[PDB]
Amino acid sequence: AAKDVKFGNDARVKMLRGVNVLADAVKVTLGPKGRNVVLDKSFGAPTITKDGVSVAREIELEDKFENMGAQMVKEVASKANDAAGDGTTTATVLAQAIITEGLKAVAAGMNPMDLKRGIDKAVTAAVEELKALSVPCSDSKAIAQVGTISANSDETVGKLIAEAMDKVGKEGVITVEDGTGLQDELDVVEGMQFDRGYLSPYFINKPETGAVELESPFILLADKKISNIREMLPVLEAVAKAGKPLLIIAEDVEGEALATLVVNTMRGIVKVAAVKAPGFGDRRKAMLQDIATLTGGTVISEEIGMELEKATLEDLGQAKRVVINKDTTTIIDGVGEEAAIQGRVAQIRQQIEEATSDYDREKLQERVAKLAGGVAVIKVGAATEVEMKEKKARVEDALHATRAAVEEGVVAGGGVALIRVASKLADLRGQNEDQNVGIKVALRAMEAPLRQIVLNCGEEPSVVANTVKGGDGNYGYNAATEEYGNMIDMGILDPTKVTRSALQYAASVAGLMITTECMVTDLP
Amino acid sequence: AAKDVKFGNDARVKMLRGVNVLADAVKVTLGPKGRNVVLDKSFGAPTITKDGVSVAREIELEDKFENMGAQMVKEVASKANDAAGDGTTTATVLAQAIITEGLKAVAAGMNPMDLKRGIDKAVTAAVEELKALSVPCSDSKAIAQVGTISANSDETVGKLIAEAMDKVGKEGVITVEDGTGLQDELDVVEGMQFDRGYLSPYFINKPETGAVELESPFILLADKKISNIREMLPVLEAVAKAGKPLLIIAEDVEGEALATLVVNTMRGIVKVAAVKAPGFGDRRKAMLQDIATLTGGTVISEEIGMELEKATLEDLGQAKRVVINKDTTTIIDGVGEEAAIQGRVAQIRQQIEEATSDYDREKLQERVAKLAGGVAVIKVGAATEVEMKEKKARVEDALHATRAAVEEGVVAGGGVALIRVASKLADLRGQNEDQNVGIKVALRAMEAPLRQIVLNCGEEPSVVANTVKGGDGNYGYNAATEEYGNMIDMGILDPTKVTRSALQYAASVAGLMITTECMVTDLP
Amino acid sequence: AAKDVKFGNDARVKMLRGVNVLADAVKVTLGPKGRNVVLDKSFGAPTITKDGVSVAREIELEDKFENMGAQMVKEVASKANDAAGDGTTTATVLAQAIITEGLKAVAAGMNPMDLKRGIDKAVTAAVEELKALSVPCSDSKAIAQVGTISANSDETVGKLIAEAMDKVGKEGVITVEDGTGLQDELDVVEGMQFDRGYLSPYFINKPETGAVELESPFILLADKKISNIREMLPVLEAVAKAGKPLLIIAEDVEGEALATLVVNTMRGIVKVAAVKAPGFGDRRKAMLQDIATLTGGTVISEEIGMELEKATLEDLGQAKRVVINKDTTTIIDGVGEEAAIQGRVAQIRQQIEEATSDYDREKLQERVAKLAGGVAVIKVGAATEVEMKEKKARVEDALHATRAAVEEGVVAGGGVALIRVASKLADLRGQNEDQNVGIKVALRAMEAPLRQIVLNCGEEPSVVANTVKGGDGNYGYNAATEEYGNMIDMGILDPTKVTRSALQYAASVAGLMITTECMVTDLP
Amino acid sequence: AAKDVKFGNDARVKMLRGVNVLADAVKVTLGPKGRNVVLDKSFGAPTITKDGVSVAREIELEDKFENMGAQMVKEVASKANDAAGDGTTTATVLAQAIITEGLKAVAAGMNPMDLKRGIDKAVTAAVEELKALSVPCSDSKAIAQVGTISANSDETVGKLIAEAMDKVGKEGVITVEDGTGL
Ligand SMILES: Nc1ncnc2c1ncn2[C@@H]1O[C@H](COP(=O)(O)OP(=O)(O)OP(=O)(O)O)[C@@H](O)[C@H]1O
Ligand SMILES: Nc1ncnc2c1ncn2[C@@H]1O[C@H](COP(=O)(O)OP(=O)(O)OP(=O)(O)O)[C@@H](O)[C@H]1O
Ligand SMILES: Nc1ncnc2c1ncn2[C@@H]1O[C@H](COP(=O)(O)OP(=O)(O)OP(=O)(O)O)[C@@H](O)[C@H]1O
Ligand SMILES: [Mg+2]
Ligand SMILES: [Mg+2]
Ligand SMILES: [Mg+2]
Ligand SMILES: [Mg+2]
């Protein structure tokens, strides 16, 4: 309808106001000594949190343009979370630091394009420096430290992640779920993990993790874009008679077949789950057959005439468990016989032998690794169900952080990595002077996270930041103990992936908001 | 939607305003001589109460941030109530005292972390001192005094609780309900008490206690996560034909099964009750078999193929009564033969003999204690049903208080315990000066409850507090008689668990409020 | 209802205000160095776009008359987009330039008719000059450059378009869709393209392209305007039983048939697609029989008694795919045998031989070209489905731009073509002085797009525009590299059709608003 | 009275807005193509003038901070009028340009005192360069050209002033007054 349009300086001022509000509200929770934020949980008691993710999620400014700026920086922090699993607060702190200085530069009269080029160059150089300073994470000690640091100082999370990590190799498939009692357990089931997000967010039965859990489910191996719900109706009735959950690996469920199935999720005919089918054509049928032989099911495809109307319970797959995330789906301990799995992996190994292209060999090696490795199951022994879900979510996010670390290395925590990077890149320049100014803005932003942590601790950020900059290597300020020392020695590690993703995304949103000239919104 | 965000000083000022409003409204009711609070009972007549629980529950500030502050100090007081059953007003009085002084310190310029560390250290030392000064509660006289004091001067409650307590030992299971006549009756039956909460609050038929009472119910021993209401529909029909109430001990009723059971419970086909199954795997099946042999029923499990579709009336358990609370469920006088119970306890004793781990031996000894100990039934007698319910609720809360006392000792009542603790810890100091200031704030808070009681009595709190501080041991001020004397001699006892929980929770909420920097709420 | 009427100067002032708002919001995104515009995407995160089409689409002024002016200049830009596929922002930039200067001329006192005549004359001369300066686009190099420039610096789009273009000739039929994976493919199916827009916008299953895709559908070769759905109800049931999609090439679907087909299309009983039948009388039946022989179906017509009630599954045509746009519909690999197609094209060649009129020979030659040439299929390869849709949309719009270029030539990009045209037409005059003023206004407008691009780059538009005007031929300012040079050498090409359409439409809307005297709108 | 105090960039922006208002009023009267400015007078008819000093004198803004900026940059035109008698529009144009570019550097973290020192050094060197680049203006033709350019390209005024200085020499005194004729 009628819309309000802001141009230039007014638009950027509103942007900065909204970004400042969100960034303050989130950054007050950065570091181990973060403050508390009281979020009004509607009718119930307020939730006091030190988690910047929740504070950012709950922030929605009244003013439409300020709200828009807050939402953009928030969503870029969310991109950082998705890419890394940690550093959303750091990304917001970095984003505000570039944005506040950058928008001041724009309001001065400097060219937004030059500033964006300078910040892009500085952040690219910063990522190169972080890769240079990154130390590979292969020993279980570093993995435990990373898990502890990403679990908000939880040593048990770090040590369990390290144990399960070394048990199945650094590239192995690891899953976590609730335990039996108050003791943890480590198991090696024979399953696999294929990228398949849920086709509807309403499938989520776990609000603490945004994932769908099915125990002893029925795996339907559709190789056709499902458009109607009528042709699996006998199959749905058979599953309901069986009572086990039903999940669907189809190419794409579109139209009413989705919506009706969506409706079924609140009707509870079965525990409906729908995921996309990874791979295409030959690859799609290859991993579909792999899932069939892992779960003992049969691949049903319309091309071979195997229509969903004739799909019986025997053709339907079966496994011990399945987990569905927004990006990938892990099938856990399929009931298919070990002999069939061994035959399938042998066939794919001879496919590797006959393969000549690098892509073919690499993909088939990934396939055989997926089938042979299985899944590492962790049964965390927390006391209560609330503690079950919270500890398992912490373990999951810290596990993702550890995987990011082992794929990209680790660096000094507490913002020391960015401090060292800024010290290394202090001399970097650009084509013109405004690019150099953007570089300086990015360097101050790199300083920002450690300063914010020290500010949260109550100490003066200037003295501590100067002391850390004076030190070399990984010298820094342990905030939890409020004492200086080597971050690696005191276990304050940051996954290099986390830091590089946070900085890159903060630079992205900063440049986007700096170069923005007009904003349109619904009129109040 | 749109949200209002407060930062720092404004946030904490709103916090203090809300806390002050709630704390005044509640603390005017502390002690035997508490004032009256008139709560508007909507259309009907107002309710005058001296019970701080009701006053706190009815308090909901108009201003959103003041509302959040009041709501969460209220919820911390509720945590104290749940942990102890008494000292809700004392927890609020302590909470206001720390928050008022602590937030004054923050507004001065002192560091919130330093204050929180100091308060936490002072409260930990206070709990140690309270444990040191606690006198074990084993004689029936002390139990009677604690029961009387937790019911706000109800001698009959204390004496009946003491009698039932000594009848079945300090670790026995005790339940209370309405008697036949106007006199109290003490009985010993063969029941048991397993931790389980009702899966829906709508099951509560007793608003005065938040508990579900089923007389002569049908116990269904589910060992499976119930997800549908279809499979026990014949069982529901059989129960409705019988007419007795139906309760289900299930692992977890999730999905549409819970919703259908709720729809049934406001449709009243049967008296539907659902509780979670305590224990896991071997322990779960062990206590399920214990319940089966106590109630004469048969364990129904899908693993052995004993599916709920074939569940008949014979397999259903039967007992004299069952009481369901939010955390624990007690079965009263199951119809199983004494010979079967004796055989089961003999089997578990043999399990104890063959067990070697301390955990297994302790768990099996707990099982045999719960089985062979029996249940002390108190058929309390009152003139009217309203008086019946009020007396039984007072007896229940005082019984919980007596259990807390016998598990943690007793201390001088009327705030004398905290006065003595502050006198003992006057010399305690922290790492820096602001930690010492937080310690002093905690000590003044320790003084606060006795001062508030004396203020309620109309006397000057300063003179009486000075006189109590000058005295040593358990010397204090009897408020009901308005005269000094030994707290134990005049029966003014406090369960040590009550006081330590109230102080610890008050310190927790105070530190959370002090370290809080930002608040978000829905825009008015 | 009640309406607000503006007259003369006030109306034109409102025109200018609304046009200025929209033109600013869109023009801040012109050129490779365009700024960012933040569009509020309702509840979700804001969308940052440099695409002027989206910014123009969002803009809707609150003031009714300002909104009206913005909407009409926006719709003229949309006409330019539809006619060319590119230059929407350029059309708006040109429109504002004429409008701002023209409405100043009207407010001065000059005659609107004289200004409109002058602008029309200048734009006609500009189109003649652009045709003169246009260089034919036949080599794959120029096609690749045009595809890259229309896709906003996407070299892969340009090269793939050039390859597919040279594969099937400059007049060949080319279609694009999603590929298998990350790799592209170039094939030539046997199909044809006919002008038939969808009869309901709700048929669109591709919001990113506004097109309807049916994979392996059933073609209904109806030769009658379908106004009732009852008589194909058995056909609809048969199609639903088969499960394949369904499209109708009837003359028109209107009234009850249209409403019921729409109801079906949100109910999704079958994938309903309705398109009008191209051709008339002999031509209509001729192309209907061509579709029948290509898809192996049978033409169903009420004139020969072949009523839709007796239409069985065999009579319906079958093809590999079909794409429906708002203006034309393309079939993809009909299942008709190649022998039947060869016989049909031989018959139409004999018709060419027997044809005497130029129209008959040309139409039959077009028919044989459509049948024999087939359809070029591009399976573009991208990582993700969202990337699939975005890359295929960019490829489609750049393909339309390349077709416009090859049918009208190419000119210097970055507004250099219009600068050169203004330099050539600087001497042109009109009947009276105000016509000359309109000519000068149009010349400044021709200068406007390059000036706006340079302004977006941050450089001074005056110096760069003077330097470009000083140069001759195709000398200009590469904005992406921020350096001068030959546009053809640096690959900054503009399809001459795009530029002439943008300029002509801008002149059209400018003259319409200048000659406008009265406004009526709904009263606020 | 009660004071409003504005710090940093808010104060600088308001000051610059006032300077921009005054200088925009003044600088539409610069050059041969510069236009005129109407100044409303409390007594009599409005004054149509092209002098930058008159426009600068008349400018006073509602906002107290913008008015502070305007009254501060008005001193450039006033001092230029008092000292040289001409160049008041050029003086105001130069002042605003130094202010606009100076405030840009101040916003970029530069030290304003050192910016002032650099501006002063540049202007001292510029005065030296002007003294070097100047040429004597002694003949009547150059005086006619100077007067013509200073009278907004009015050749009659320049010729009249050249004739007046020729008649009264170096020691004579020339004054300008109202005349009856056309
Ligand atoms: N003991 C410590 N001393 C100093 N810095 C620490 C310490 N522990 C963690 N850090 C640093 O503090 C940051 C962790 O803060 P926090 O976990 O609150 O937020 P985050 O990593 O930005 O993201 P998220 O809110 O999503 O968890 C990291 O930069 C980490 O290196
Ligand atoms: N006769 C008495 N003289 C002095 N203090 C007493 C006397 N009886 C009880 N007290 C003290 O007064 C307090 C009891 O007050 P009250 O029961 O109103 O509130 P509470 O214990 O804070 O909690 P709740 O409101 O939940 O019952 C305890 O601290 C108790 O030790
Ligand atoms: N590298 C370049 N240097 C200079 N001008 C360029 C360059 N690349 C493209 N252009 C010019 O910039 C314009 C392309 O801008 P843009 O694609 O944002 O908008 P548009 O052509 O008006 O239409 P649309 O918004 O519908 O795509 C064209 O005039 C093109 O000739
Ligand atoms: Mg973190
Ligand atoms: Mg009490
Ligand atoms: Mg374009
Ligand atoms: Mg002059």
Coordinates of N, CA and C in Angstrom, one line a residue, chain C residues 265-306:
Chain C
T265 N -6.9 -25.2 -9.8 CA -5.5 -24.9 -9.8 C -5.0 -24.6 -8.4
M266 N -5.8 -23.9 -7.6 CA -5.4 -24.0 -6.1 C -5.7 -25.3 -5.4
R267 N -6.8 -26.0 -5.9 CA -7.0 -27.3 -5.3 C -6.0 -28.4 -5.9
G268 N -5.4 -28.1 -7.0 CA -4.4 -29.0 -7.5 C -4.8 -30.4 -7.8
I269 N -6.1 -30.6 -8.3 CA -6.5 -31.9 -8.7 C -5.7 -32.3 -10.0
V270 N -5.5 -31.4 -10.9 CA -4.5 -31.5 -12.0 C -3.8 -30.2 -12.1
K271 N -2.6 -30.3 -12.8 CA -1.8 -29.1 -13.0 C -2.4 -28.3 -14.2
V272 N -3.4 -27.5 -13.9 CA -4.2 -26.8 -14.9 C -3.4 -25.7 -15.5
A273 N -3.3 -25.7 -16.9 CA -2.8 -24.6 -17.6 C -3.7 -24.3 -18.8
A274 N -4.0 -23.0 -19.0 CA -4.9 -22.6 -20.0 C -4.3 -21.5 -20.8
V275 N -4.2 -21.7 -22.1 CA -3.6 -20.7 -23.0 C -4.5 -20.5 -24.2
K276 N -4.5 -19.3 -24.8 CA -5.3 -19.0 -25.9 C -4.7 -19.7 -27.2
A277 N -5.6 -19.9 -28.2 CA -5.1 -20.6 -29.4 C -4.7 -19.5 -30.4
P278 N -3.4 -19.5 -30.8 CA -2.9 -18.6 -31.8 C -3.5 -19.0 -33.2
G279 N -3.4 -18.0 -34.1 CA -3.9 -18.2 -35.5 C -5.4 -18.0 -35.5
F280 N -6.0 -17.9 -36.7 CA -7.4 -17.7 -37.0 C -7.9 -18.5 -38.2
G281 N -9.0 -19.2 -38.0 CA -9.6 -19.9 -39.1 C -8.7 -21.0 -39.7
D282 N -8.2 -20.7 -40.9 CA -7.3 -21.7 -41.6 C -6.0 -21.7 -40.8
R283 N -5.4 -20.6 -40.4 CA -4.2 -20.6 -39.6 C -4.4 -21.3 -38.3
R284 N -5.5 -21.0 -37.6 CA -5.7 -21.7 -36.3 C -5.7 -23.2 -36.4
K285 N -6.5 -23.7 -37.3 CA -6.5 -25.2 -37.5 C -5.1 -25.7 -38.0
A286 N -4.4 -24.9 -38.8 CA -3.1 -25.3 -39.3 C -2.1 -25.5 -38.2
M287 N -1.9 -24.5 -37.3 CA -1.0 -24.7 -36.2 C -1.6 -25.7 -35.2
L288 N -2.9 -25.8 -35.1 CA -3.4 -26.9 -34.2 C -3.0 -28.3 -34.7
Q289 N -3.1 -28.5 -36.0 CA -2.7 -29.7 -36.6 C -1.2 -29.9 -36.4
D290 N -0.4 -28.8 -36.5 CA 1.0 -28.9 -36.3 C 1.3 -29.4 -34.9
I291 N 0.6 -28.8 -33.9 CA 0.8 -29.2 -32.5 C 0.4 -30.7 -32.4
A292 N -0.7 -31.1 -33.1 CA -1.1 -32.5 -33.0 C -0.1 -33.4 -33.5
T293 N 0.5 -33.1 -34.7 CA 1.5 -34.0 -35.3 C 2.9 -33.9 -34.5
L294 N 3.2 -32.8 -33.9 CA 4.4 -32.8 -33.1 C 4.2 -33.5 -31.8
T295 N 3.1 -33.4 -31.1 CA 2.9 -34.1 -29.8 C 2.2 -35.4 -29.9
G296 N 1.9 -35.9 -31.2 CA 1.3 -37.2 -31.4 C -0.2 -37.2 -31.0
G297 N -0.8 -36.0 -30.7 CA -2.2 -35.9 -30.4 C -3.1 -35.8 -31.6
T298 N -4.4 -35.6 -31.3 CA -5.4 -35.4 -32.3 C -6.2 -34.1 -32.1
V299 N -6.4 -33.3 -33.1 CA -7.1 -32.1 -33.0 C -8.6 -32.4 -32.7
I300 N -9.1 -31.9 -31.6 CA -10.5 -32.0 -31.2 C -11.2 -30.7 -31.5
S301 N -12.3 -30.8 -32.4 CA -13.0 -29.6 -32.8 C -14.5 -30.0 -32.8
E302 N -15.3 -29.0 -32.4 CA -16.8 -29.2 -32.4 C -17.4 -29.2 -33.8
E303 N -16.7 -28.5 -34.7 CA -17.2 -28.4 -36.1 C -17.2 -29.8 -36.8
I304 N -16.3 -30.6 -36.5 CA -16.2 -32.0 -37.1 C -17.0 -33.0 -36.3
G305 N -17.7 -32.5 -35.2 CA -18.4 -33.3 -34.3 C -17.6 -33.9 -33.2
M306 N -16.3 -33.7 -33.2 CA -15.4 -34.2 -32.2 C -15.6 -33.4 -30.9

